[PDB]
Amino acid sequence: LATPSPFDMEKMVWLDVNILEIRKSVLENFGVDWSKQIPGPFAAFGKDFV
Amino acid sequence: LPKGSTTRDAVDRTLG
Numbered sequence: 482l483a484t485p486s487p488f489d490m491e492k493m494v495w496l497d498v499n500i501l502e503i504r505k506s507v508l509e510n511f512g513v514d515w516s517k518q519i520p521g522p523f524a525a526f527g528k529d530f531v
Numbered sequence: 532l533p534k535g536s537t538t539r540d541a542v543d544r545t546l547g
Contacts, residue, residue: 497547499545499546501546
C-alpha cells in the first residue's frame with residue numbers, strides 16, 4: 482500500500498569555468514629590395530649577298 | 532591597465 486514520492490530531491494552542483502588567453506606578435510620589414518633580373522646585351526647581323 | 536579603469540575591476544572579479 483506504500484506509494485513513492487512524485488520525484489527525488491537531487492543535489493545541486495555549481496560550476497565555475499575560467500578561460501584565459503594572451504596573444505602577442507611582431508612584424509618587421511626592413512632593407513632595400515633591388516631588381517634581380519635585367520636585360521642583357523644584344524647583337525644582330527644582316528646582309529644581302531645577291 | 533590603468534588603476535582607475537573599469538576593465539581592471541572586472542579582471543579582479545575573475546578566477547575567484
